[PDB]
Design a binder for this molecule. Structure first.
Ligand code: SAM
Length: 371
């Protein structure tokens, strides 16, 4: 896709209306959300959707109930807003307690057990006594385990729709919700001779340890540019996460801007910067959406997202490369790290004209220079 195509919001028809989608936004052609859309019915007056994506799953409630939506993805919030659907940039556990009659939760299984648990408890806390939860998921991705936990938190629960491995259950709050679990985790790492303490919320990439690919990128970067090669330079970190690249580059004296689509990750980066007495801009952004049109950089770095066991480069990851080429000044440089067999080489050749391979073992570090 072109940059404009990546960032474009496209409305698709459904009976009575339209819904905006875009590349990089969850909840489109997603069987879990599709099953919710076929199943959810109004109950009471106030509903809360804790993982809406583009908003298809809970859409049947719109215009029949008051619906609030809490969403961590900037890309998804762009879509919801374009669709005229009320939505807030918010973590699931930021939901008001005891304020809702109905909650809708497509299980965020891809973000892991702790994130799902925090979402389940947030759902339980959000409901008034006697309120109900629509819980949807995939038996291949923890549905039975998470449904069992929801039943323990809430009370009576029953499957109300099934299609292949996909499930929607309906549950009733019959008991008091517990307190939120502890959400913050910290760990310390020595990177290129300096000590860092990273801080993060549930669901982030590489919780609890610095990703070996990210370390490899930093090693290749310091080898290529020197320990002083980053000082005073403007750096863009595409997909900054909790700051595995951002913090060291800041410490090395770069002027760093991190862009990150996931709110939980943005807050994680902010806490790490503070705890380590480092300054950088930690932006909640769908790729470079938060940047001015004119912003350019001397160095761009990325450990892009990837589909686990996938063989195909993700739309977001392809956009990272396109944006990198467009956002570099003449003579600026790009570092990208990936799994060894992802086909980034032709993409770099197309957007930059040439590329180099700085490292290749467990991961490959690719390099390109803006002409
Ligand atoms: C492989 S992780 C790397 C995180 C961090 N830079 C590191 O090296 O540990 C890729 C990051 O890209 C982020 N991401 C996914 N889609 C994005 C998008 N549309 N815009 C910006 N960041 C995105 C993810 O949430 C994740 O934090």
């Amino acid at each position: 896709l072109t940059r404009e195509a990546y960032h474009r919001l496209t409305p698709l028809p459904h009976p009575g209306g339209r819904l905006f989608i875009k590349p990089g936004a969850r909840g489109y052609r997603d069987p879990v959300h599709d099953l919710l859309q076929k199943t959810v019915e109004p109950f009471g007056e106030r509903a809360l959707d804790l993982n809406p994506g583009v908003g298809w799953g809970s859409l049947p409630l719109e215009g029949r109930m008051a619906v609030e939506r809490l969403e961590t993805s900037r890309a998804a919030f762009r879509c919801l807003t374009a669709s005229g659907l009320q939505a807030r940039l918010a973590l699931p556990w930021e939901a008001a307690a005891g304020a809702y009659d109905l909650v809708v939760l497509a299980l965020p299984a891809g973000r892991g057990t702790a994130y799902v648990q925090a979402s389940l408890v947030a759902a339980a806390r959000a409901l008034r006594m006697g309120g109900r939860l629509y819980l949807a998921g995939d038996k291949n991705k923890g549905f039975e385990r998470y449904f069992k936990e929801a039943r323990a938190l809430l009370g009576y629960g029953v499957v109300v729709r099934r299609e292949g491995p996909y499930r929607v259950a309906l549950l009733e709050k019959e008991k008091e919700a517990p307190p939120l679990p502890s959400l913050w985790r910290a760990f310390s790492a020595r990177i290129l001779g300096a000590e860092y303490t990273f801080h993060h919320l549930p669901g982030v990439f590489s919780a609890g340890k610095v990703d070996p690919a990210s370390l490899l990128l930093l090693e290749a970067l310091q080898e290529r540019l020197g320990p002083e090669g980053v000082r005073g330079r403007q750096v863009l970190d595409l997909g900054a996460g909790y700051g595995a690249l951002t913090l060291p580059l800041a410490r090395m004296g770069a002027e760093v801007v991190g862009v990150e689509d996931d709110l939980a990750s943005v807050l994680s980066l902010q806490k790490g910067l503070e705890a380590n007495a480092l300054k950088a801009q930690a932006l909640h952004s769908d790729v470079d959406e938060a940047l001015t049109e004119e912003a350019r950089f001397d160095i761009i770095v990325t450990n892009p997202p990837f589909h686990v066991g996938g063989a195909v480069i993700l739309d977001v990851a392809q956009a990272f490369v396109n944006v990198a080429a467009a956002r570099l000044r003449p003579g600026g440089v790009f570092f990208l790290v990936s799994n060894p067999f992802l086909k980034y080489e032709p993409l770099l050749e197309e957007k930059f004209g040439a590329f180099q391979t700085l490292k290749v073992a467990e991961y490959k570090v690719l390099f390109a220079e803006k002409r």
